Every structure is written in C-alpha cells, then in structure tokens.
Design an enzyme around this catalytic site. Structure first.
Site, short mmCIF file in Angstrom:
data_model
loop_
_atom_site.label_atom_id
_atom_site.label_comp_id
_atom_site.label_asym_id
_atom_site.label_seq_id
_atom_site.Cartn_x
_atom_site.Cartn_y
_atom_site.Cartn_z
N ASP A 155 7.67 -0.65 9.73
CA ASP A 155 7.19 0.11 10.87
C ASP A 155 5.89 0.82 10.49
O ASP A 155 5.72 1.21 9.35
CB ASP A 155 8.23 1.15 11.31
CG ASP A 155 9.57 0.52 11.67
OD1 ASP A 155 9.61 -0.33 12.59
OD2 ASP A 155 10.58 0.86 11.02
N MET A 167 0.86 -1.18 0.00
CA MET A 167 0.00 0.00 0.00
C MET A 167 0.89 1.23 0.00
O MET A 167 0.50 2.31 -0.45
CB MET A 167 -0.85 0.02 1.26
CG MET A 167 0.00 0.07 2.52
SD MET A 167 -0.94 0.10 4.03
CE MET A 167 -1.89 1.57 3.77
N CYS A 210 -13.68 -15.39 -2.81
CA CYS A 210 -14.44 -15.48 -1.57
C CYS A 210 -15.77 -16.19 -1.81
O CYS A 210 -16.42 -15.97 -2.83
CB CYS A 210 -14.72 -14.09 -1.03
SG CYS A 210 -13.17 -13.36 -0.42
N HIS A 244 -3.20 -6.36 11.83
CA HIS A 244 -4.25 -5.40 11.55
C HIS A 244 -5.57 -6.15 11.38
O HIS A 244 -5.64 -7.16 10.67
CB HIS A 244 -3.95 -4.60 10.28
CG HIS A 244 -2.86 -3.59 10.44
ND1 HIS A 244 -1.53 -3.90 10.34
CD2 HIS A 244 -2.92 -2.25 10.65
CE1 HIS A 244 -0.81 -2.80 10.49
NE2 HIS A 244 -1.63 -1.79 10.68
N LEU A 288 -10.94 -1.79 -1.82
CA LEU A 288 -10.76 -1.81 -0.37
C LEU A 288 -12.10 -1.56 0.31
O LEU A 288 -12.37 -2.11 1.37
CB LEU A 288 -9.78 -0.72 0.07
CG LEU A 288 -9.77 -0.42 1.57
CD1 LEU A 288 -9.42 -1.67 2.32
CD2 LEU A 288 -8.78 0.69 1.89
N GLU A 346 1.44 2.71 15.87
CA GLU A 346 1.31 1.85 17.03
C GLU A 346 -0.04 1.92 17.73
O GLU A 346 -0.92 2.67 17.33
CB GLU A 346 2.44 2.16 18.01
CG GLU A 346 3.75 2.41 17.29
CD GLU A 346 4.93 2.54 18.23
OE1 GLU A 346 4.73 3.03 19.37
OE2 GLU A 346 6.06 2.17 17.82
N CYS A 376 -18.06 -13.42 -2.37
CA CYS A 376 -17.45 -12.31 -3.09
C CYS A 376 -18.45 -11.50 -3.94
O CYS A 376 -19.17 -12.06 -4.77
CB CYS A 376 -16.32 -12.83 -3.99
SG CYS A 376 -15.66 -11.45 -4.97
N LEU A 381 -6.68 6.14 -0.91
CA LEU A 381 -7.14 5.01 -0.12
C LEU A 381 -8.66 4.96 -0.05
O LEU A 381 -9.26 3.91 -0.33
CB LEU A 381 -6.54 5.08 1.29
CG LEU A 381 -6.83 3.91 2.23
CD1 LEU A 381 -5.75 3.82 3.30
CD2 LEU A 381 -8.21 4.10 2.85
N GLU A 435 0.76 2.29 23.56
CA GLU A 435 2.15 2.55 23.22
C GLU A 435 2.34 4.04 22.96
O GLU A 435 3.38 4.62 23.31
CB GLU A 435 2.57 1.77 21.97
CG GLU A 435 2.38 0.26 22.05
CD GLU A 435 2.75 -0.44 20.75
OE1 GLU A 435 3.96 -0.49 20.41
OE2 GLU A 435 1.83 -0.93 20.05
N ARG A 466 0.28 1.24 -3.71
CA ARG A 466 -1.12 1.45 -4.05
C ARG A 466 -1.64 2.86 -3.85
O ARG A 466 -2.45 3.35 -4.65
CB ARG A 466 -1.99 0.49 -3.23
CG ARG A 466 -3.39 0.27 -3.80
CD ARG A 466 -3.34 -0.45 -5.14
NE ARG A 466 -4.67 -0.80 -5.64
CZ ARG A 466 -5.55 0.08 -6.11
NH1 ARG A 466 -5.26 1.37 -6.16
NH2 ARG A 466 -6.73 -0.35 -6.54
N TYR A 467 -1.17 3.53 -2.81
CA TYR A 467 -1.67 4.86 -2.50
C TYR A 467 -0.67 6.01 -2.55
O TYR A 467 -1.02 7.14 -2.22
CB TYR A 467 -2.35 4.83 -1.13
CG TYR A 467 -3.30 3.66 -0.99
CD1 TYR A 467 -3.22 2.79 0.10
CD2 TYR A 467 -4.26 3.40 -1.98
CE1 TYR A 467 -4.06 1.67 0.19
CE2 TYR A 467 -5.10 2.29 -1.89
CZ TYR A 467 -4.99 1.43 -0.81
OH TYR A 467 -5.80 0.33 -0.75
N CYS A 512 -8.21 -9.70 0.66
CA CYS A 512 -8.73 -9.14 -0.57
C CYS A 512 -8.58 -7.62 -0.57
O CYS A 512 -8.66 -6.98 -1.62
CB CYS A 512 -10.19 -9.56 -0.77
SG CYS A 512 -10.21 -11.28 -1.35
#
Ligand SMILES: C=CC1=C(C)c2cc3[nH]c(cc4nc(cc5[nH]c(cc1n2)c(C)c5C=C)C(C)=C4CCC(=O)O)c(CCC(=O)O)c3C
Ligand SMILES: C=CC1=C(C)c2cc3[nH]c(cc4nc(cc5[nH]c(cc1n2)c(C)c5C=C)C(C)=C4CCC(=O)O)c(CCC(=O)O)c3C
Ligand SMILES: C[C@H](CCC(=O)O)[C@H]1CC[C@H]2[C@@H]3[C@H](O)C[C@@H]4C[C@H](O)CC[C@]4(C)[C@H]3C[C@H](O)[C@]12C
Ligand SMILES: C[C@H](CCC(=O)O)[C@H]1CC[C@H]2[C@@H]3[C@H](O)C[C@@H]4C[C@H](O)CC[C@]4(C)[C@H]3C[C@H](O)[C@]12C
Ligand SMILES: C[C@H](CCC(=O)O)[C@H]1CC[C@H]2[C@@H]3[C@H](O)C[C@@H]4C[C@H](O)CC[C@]4(C)[C@H]3C[C@H](O)[C@]12C
Ligand SMILES: C[C@H](CCC(=O)O)[C@H]1CC[C@H]2[C@@H]3[C@H](O)C[C@@H]4C[C@H](O)CC[C@]4(C)[C@H]3C[C@H](O)[C@]12C
Ligand code: FES
Ligand code: FES
Ligand SMILES: [Pb+2]
Lengths: 359, 359
Positions: free
Chosen positions: A276, A12, A339, A199, A34, A279, A342, A28, A283, A100-101, A132
């Site tokens: 990275d 991404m 899917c 995520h 997405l 967070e 889908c 995005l 944190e 992607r972005y 996906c």
C-alpha cells in the site's frame, strides 16, 4: 541449526509512523543513485524538511504511515517457511530486510548477514520491474557498502534483480483484479476500465534507457492475457513530482479524461509496487472528485488490494528464490547491460560485483 | 467461384519508386488522424515539396523505394491459400490491399470489395501493435469512406485491430534473430546486444494515452521469453522527426551510447514494422559510422531482416484471420476504449461503426 542461506529483501521501505517522514525524505534526497542536485549534502536536508509536511499529510491520509515493514516480514517469514521444505540443501534460510531509506537500512542488514556467517547471500529485489532508481540503487547500496567498509564479502552474493512476468506474480494480480471487479454493480462489470497505475519516471531517465517502462508493460500484458482481456485496459503513470516532464498519461488526468468521455466505472491497479502507498488526487482529494462527479457523472473508482499478505505471493517469492538457486545464475542477463546513456560510474562497478561472485 | 470472404490488409503503404515520394508525403501530411496543423489543406502541399528531396534520398539509400506492395501481395496470396483449407465455410477468400497514402488506396479497395459482392469483409491491420496514428487512421479511413459516400456497407464488417503477441509472429521474430546472431563471430555472440527498434511517437501522443508503446513492449518481452534471454536487450525508438520531444531512448543515441560504453556488437530488430523501411543514421551515413568506429571501436552493427516474405508469416496471418472468424468477434476489447485524452471525434465513430456491425 545456524543460518546457511540468507535472503536480503530489497525495497525503499517506508516511514513507519508520521514521525519517521523526515528521516525517510532525508536519505531519499541524499541518494545520488536516485538523483543528483548541485550542492547535494546541503539542499537535500532542506528539501526534506521543506516538503516533509505535505508528505506527512499524505501518509496521514492512508493510516498514518507505511505498513511495508510489517508486510515485508510476513511475506519474508512465509517465504522462508517454504524454502526449507523446497530446498533443504540450502537450509536453514533466513530473510533480512534491506530498506533503502529507513531502518533496517540495507547496510544494516548486510552487516548482520556477515556477523551471522552465511554461506550464500541473495540480493532479492522486491520491485518486480527493474528501474535504475529502485533496484539499481538497492543494488548499488550493497556495492557502495563494501567499498565503504573497504572490506570484501565473507559470503557468496548472487541476485534476483527482476521478475516482471513471474507466473505466480501474474496469478496474484489476476486474482485481485477479479475480486474488485465483483465489487462493481453486476451490470457494470463488463464496461469497467482497468487502469494499471505504475509510478512514473522523469523523461530524462526514460530517455537514457531505463528498462522499467518496458518491463511494467510486460507485467500488464501477462495479467490481461491471464484474464483473457475480459475488460478494456490502459497503463498509466501515477503521482509524478515536479515541473519537469514525466512519462506517459498521468493517472490523474487519465481518470478525469476517461470520465469526460463516458467511462464511469474505473478500476485502478497497483501493478509496480506490491505494498500500500500514497494514492492519487481523485482518490484522496474530495472537491476534485466532487467536480468529477458533477461534470462527468463518475460512479465508481475502486482500487485493487495490494499483494500485501496474499499466501500465493509468498509462494511466488519462494518459487523465485528456488529457481534462482537451481539455475545457478548470479544475476539476470539484463543486469550485465547498463543504460545506453548511463552516466553513473557506480553502475558498471555493481555489474562486476555480482557477475564476479564466487561460483 | 465468387469470392465469399474479403480481407482488407491495412498499412500506410510506401512509394514504389522515387517518383511516388511526393504524393506519398502529400496524403500523409494531409492526414488529420495522424496530425493536426493550422490551415492543413494549405500546409500539407507545401511541406510535401519541402521534404520530398530528403525522403527520395533516403529511399534511394535503401534500393530506390519501398517494397511493401509486392511483399504484402505475396503474403496476401499466401494468406488466402491457407484460408481456403482452414475455413472451408467462409471460402473462397480474397485479400485486398488498403494502403493509407499510396495506391491501392483504402477507399479504392473498399469500393472494390462491394463491387465483388462479399458477404463478409475483414479490416485486418498489418501493424501488430496498435497506435491511433497507424491502425487508428486506417480504421477511421474506412468509416470516413461511408460517411462520405453517404450510403452504408453492403457487407458485414469486422476487424483484427491488433495482435502484438501472436505466437507465430513471435516465433518469426525469434527465428530471424537467431539467424542474424549466427552472422556474428561464434565467440562474440553472447555479447551481442539486441536493440529492438520501433518507430517513436511524439510525447504529446504518448501522454494522451496511445496504447502503442505498451503493446510494442509486450511484443519485445514475448520474443526474448521465446529466445530464453540468450542475450541482453533494450527497446529503443527510432527515426523520430522534428524539434519537439518524442519517446524513450533514440536509436541513434543508444547505439553511440552503447559503443561509448564498450558494447561493440549490436543487433537491431525491426519490432514494430514488418517491411523494409529507412535505416538509422549509423547504418546509412558513412562519416558517422567512421567517427564511431574510431572513438568506440564498434565491431559489428547488424539489422535482422524484415518478416517480409517468411512463409511462417503467411501461416501467422492466416492463423489470425481463422481464429478471428471462429471467435466470431467484431473487434478487440481494446478498441471499445478510446484514449483517455482523445480529442478526435471520429475515433468514437469508428468504434461504434465496428461494434455496431450486424452479427
Ligand atoms: C528516477 C526516478 C524517480 C524519482 C526522482 C522519484 C522520486 C520520488 N519518489 C518519492 C517517493 C516514492 N516513490 C515511490 C516509487 C517509485 N518511484 C520511482 C521513481 C522515482 N521516484 C519508481 C520507478 C517506483 C517504483 C515502484 C514510492 C512507493 C514512494 C513513497 C510515496 C508514495 O508516493 O507512495 C519521493 C518522496 C515523496 C514526494 O511526494 O516527494 C520522491 C522525491
Ligand atoms: C502520430 C505519430 C506519428 C507521426 C507524427 C509520424 C510521422 C511521420 N511519419 C513518416 C513516415 C513513416 N512512418 C512510419 C511508421 C510509423 N510511424 C508512426 C507514427 C508517426 N509517424 C508509428 C507508430 C509507426 C510504426 C508502426 C514508416 C514505415 C514511414 C515511412 C518511412 C521510414 O521512416 O521508413 C513521415 C514521412 C517522412 C518525413 O520525415 O517527412 C512523417 C512526417
Ligand atoms: C538548478 C537545479 C537544476 C539542475 C539540473 O537539473 O541540471 C534545480 C534542481 C532542484 C532545484 C531546487 C528545488 O526545486 C528546491 C527549491 C524549490 C524553490 O521553489 C526554488 C529553490 C529550490 C532550492 C530549487 C533551486 C533550483 O531550481 C534547483 C537546485
Ligand atoms: C520531487 C522534487 C520536488 C518537486 C515537488 O515539489 O513535487 C523535485 C525537485 C528537484 C527535482 C530533481 C532535479 O530537477 C534534478 C533532476 C532533473 C532531471 O531532469 C529529472 C530527475 C531529477 C533528479 C529531478 C527529480 C525531481 O523532479 C525533483 C527531486
Ligand atoms: C503554430 C503550429 C502549432 C500548433 C499546434 O500544434 O499547437 C506549428 C505546428 C507545425 C508548424 C509548421 C511546421 O513545423 C512546418 C514549417 C517548419 C518551418 O521551419 C517554419 C514554418 C512551418 C510551416 C511551421 C509553422 C508553425 O511553427 C507550425 C504550423
Ligand atoms: C517533422 C515535421 C516537419 C517539420 C519540419 O519541416 O522540419 C512536423 C510537421 C507537422 C508536425 C506535427 C504537428 O505539429 C502535430 C503534432 C503537434 C504535437 O505537439 C507534437 C507532435 C505532432 C504530431 C507534430 C510532429 C512533427 O513536429 C511534425 C510532423
Ligand atoms: S543509470 Fe541505468 S545502468 Fe546506470
Ligand atoms: S487518438 Fe486514440 S482513441 Fe482517439
Ligand atoms: Pb512515422
């Protein structure tokens, strides 16, 4: 000599500086692969601008931006190096960054791969686990590209669409975990809780059949197997955005939940994103952590380093490309299956594209 | 001679005949470790009667009842025999059946293990994947038994609380899959979709941190790894009872979803329960299978057979107990860690009980 085998590295990407935030969020929220909103080309520009401030703050909290572009290049350069020595028949190999972005955009990298007159192009996803919304979108991007220009490829496409349990990826996670564990007090090492944090996904995506959760779960098992279950562990899902329901235990409430129950030494592990990133609440925010310590006595919350520039990661990348070329596969057997629920016409078209490639 | 090593095989059990359905549901809905209802001792009895008809019908649809008792015995007998040759030092060994909701009840088996004067008693869960609703309840039952009888163990306890990736278990699954695939037309075999179907969990249980989903996911990956991804696959969650939200794609919907999308040859695999149980809506209801065949052209939907009496299974059960004894462990490292959002004080007591066992 002229570049023979091109390697498109899909991800991404991320906003290089705080200034790129808006353009990142913009593309995005415009991604119909997405997500899908009512009026889309209209509220997308808004939603971006709207919450662009808080995201800028978040990135400021970690250095002022995403270092994915730099990291991806290092790994790319390290991968190409080994590919030339590993498979000379397909050299010279050249890596391209298909974000992607953000620039360089996927379409931007494709256009150059063309202009460079490559013989074999490999869409190599940088997400080990297939979703996906990540690999699917990067793959649908390539498809949409040619469907846009209207023209057809001038080189042979193939793809490494997933690698959740690649032995070297697993060795890297195992190495980094052991390294942080050593940063815990010698007598606490054994009671440290490893929280694999990946995520989250909205339940509506999970319920339509996204393979992501099952794959991440697989990566987690390989890792612990390799570490011989030296410590207790849990797979939790971090971040989660919006009011709607998202998957499994949230990373935040799991940390608090764990401290209210005696486990004070926690080791977070970024198991599904190799670079990275933003967070978690405990944190970044201090008052919330202040309370967590005054009410639970939390003594240690550490984060294993991202696979960033580990030399063994490049080797992992090169190995995957090499086996790929050897095997002669155009895509995993899993991509030939959408899917169960889908509802994206594009999906099936992307399947055809790769399975229908020459050779 | 006298039995030295006892082996309690834990499972929810099943009504052997339609007549046993009522007391089965009764004890089940009364299980506070499985679910918590207001005035439960007054609701369980009611819900039992209010549901018994529906369940009797379901068990009738598959032979008139559950064959778990007999199957567990055969595997038990076959496990013991292999243990006397494998572990001469702990032999003779004796298996006991501890079912949660039907005779022989967990408490009944414990009460008999002592009377036989065992030196070592092993709580061996029959669910490869750990959930707090299955293995947890079976284990909390053993603890609750001594907290009730006031007195304490006369034998040294230990437990095999999980084994989601035991190589022999994975081999049995891979063998039963290959065998069913061979029932499909030689030319459609590569198109068969493998639907690993596991019993779903309420989302509220998943979100509190149940390890079940991640472990079931591990089993699935080990199996496909062994079969070398010969076919595409998906992990879906079946049955699912009630109005609230349960996890991932539902088996019934995915089947329909898969057919509506051109996938006519499906192979269901019971990945999380080793004995015969209630089949899905498209395997039982005739009208639904009809509506499907018309609008989708569903060619064949087959179910791989349950591990049931595979001798390689007894070899699997035996290998585990043997390694367990040699390893000299009291429980897995995973058991020492409770759900991050756990709210059952008994859980922690069950943990201590096993980790505090002598030797
Ligand atoms: C369909 C499911 C998904 C939706 C709707 C989704 C949405 C988002 N993801 C974002 C950022 C991000 N998501 C990210 C990784 C993932 N995100 C994923 C799945 C989804 N992510 C999966 C699967 C990932 C795999 C690794 C990363 C790395 C960012 C960038 C910011 C950060 O949190 O690191 C942002 C923008 C920042 C914010 O706080 O608004 C949105 C709206
Ligand atoms: C906390 C989570 C869980 C709840 C609330 C749950 C509930 C139930 N489970 C039942 C039966 C059953 N559950 C079963 C395997 C599992 N069940 C599981 C988890 C749960 N099971 C997991 C995890 C399993 C797999 C390993 C089996 C095998 C039956 C017996 C009938 C059938 O579906 O074959 C019944 C009785 C039939 C009916 O509809 O009244 C209820 C209410
Ligand atoms: C109605 C629609 C739900 C579509 C769906 O899931 O089927 C939802 C999804 C995104 C929502 C929008 C986004 O959350 C962005 C805005 C948030 C504000 O608090 C309200 C307006 C706001 C502009 C929302 C309006 C409406 O609730 C939207 C458009
Ligand atoms: C993350 C963003 C803003 C919420 C926040 O301020 O944190 C929200 C607003 C609109 C939301 C989206 C819309 O509600 C439309 C979709 C609804 C589906 O149930 C999940 C995905 C889905 C595509 C949502 C993803 C995410 O929750 C969005 C994109
Ligand atoms: C109020 C309580 C919710 C408590 C909770 O878990 O937060 C819910 C959970 C189980 C529910 C019960 C069960 O669903 C069983 C019955 C279902 C009937 O349709 C209504 C009465 C019925 C007897 C329900 C009454 C009430 O809705 C209950 C008791
Ligand atoms: C499906 C069954 C019967 C309801 C009905 O008569 O139709 C009901 C009765 C008790 C319910 C359970 C109890 O309310 C306890 C739990 C409450 C959680 O919020 C969801 C899962 C949860 C574990 C419930 C699952 C399901 O709704 C149950 C098992
Ligand atoms: S959304 Fe997963 S295949 Fe289309
Ligand atoms: S409910 Fe899982 S440890 Fe208590
Ligand atoms: Pb159940």
């Amino acid at each position: 000599r002229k570049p023979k085998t091109g390697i498109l590295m899909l991800n991404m990407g991320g906003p290089e500086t705080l200034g790129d935030v808006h353009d990142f969020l913009l593309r995005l929220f415009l991604d119909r692969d997405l997500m899908t909103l009512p009026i889309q080309n209209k509220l997308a520009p808004f939603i971006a601008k709207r919450r662009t401030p808080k995201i800028q703050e978040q990135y400021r909290r970690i250095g002022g931006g995403s270092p994915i572009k730099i990291w991806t290049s290092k790994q790319g350069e390290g991968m190409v190096k080994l590919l030339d020595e590993l498979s000379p028949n397909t050299a010279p190999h050249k890596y391209y960054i298909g974000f992607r972005y953000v620039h360089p955009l996927t379409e931007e990298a494709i256009e150059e791969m063309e202009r460079d007159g490559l013989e074999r192009a490999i869409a190599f996803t940088q997400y080990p686990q297939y979703s996906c919304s990540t690999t699917g979108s990067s793959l649908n991007a390539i498809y949409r590209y040619y469907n846009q220009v209207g023209r057809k490829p001038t080189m042979k496409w193939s793809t490494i669409d997933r690698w959740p349990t690649h032995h070297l990826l697993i060795q890297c996670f195992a190495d980094h975990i052991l390294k942080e564990l050593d940063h815990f007090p010698l007598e606490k090492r054994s009671e440290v809780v490893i929280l694999f944090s990946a995520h989250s996904l909205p339940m509506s995506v999970v319920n339509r059949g996204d393979p992501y959760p099952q794959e991440v779960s697989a990566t987690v098992q390989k890792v612990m197997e390799r570490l011989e279950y030296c410590n207790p562990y849990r797979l939790v899902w971090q971040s989660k955005v919006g009011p709607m329901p998202w998957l499994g235990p949230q990373t935040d409430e799991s940390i608090k939940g764990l401290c209210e129950r005696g486990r004070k030494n926690i080791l977070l592990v970024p198991i599904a994103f190799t670079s990275d990133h933003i967070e978690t609440l405990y944190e970044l925010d201090i008052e919330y952590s202040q309370v967590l310590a005054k009410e639970c006595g939390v003594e240690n919350i550490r984060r294993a380093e991202s696979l960033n520039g580990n030399p063994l990661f490049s080797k992992a990348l090169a190995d995957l490309v090499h086996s790929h070329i050897q095997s002669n596969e155009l895509c995993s057997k899993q991509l030939t299956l959408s899917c169960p629920l889908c509802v994206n016409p594009v999906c099936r078209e992307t399947k055809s594209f790769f399975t229908s490639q020459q050779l």
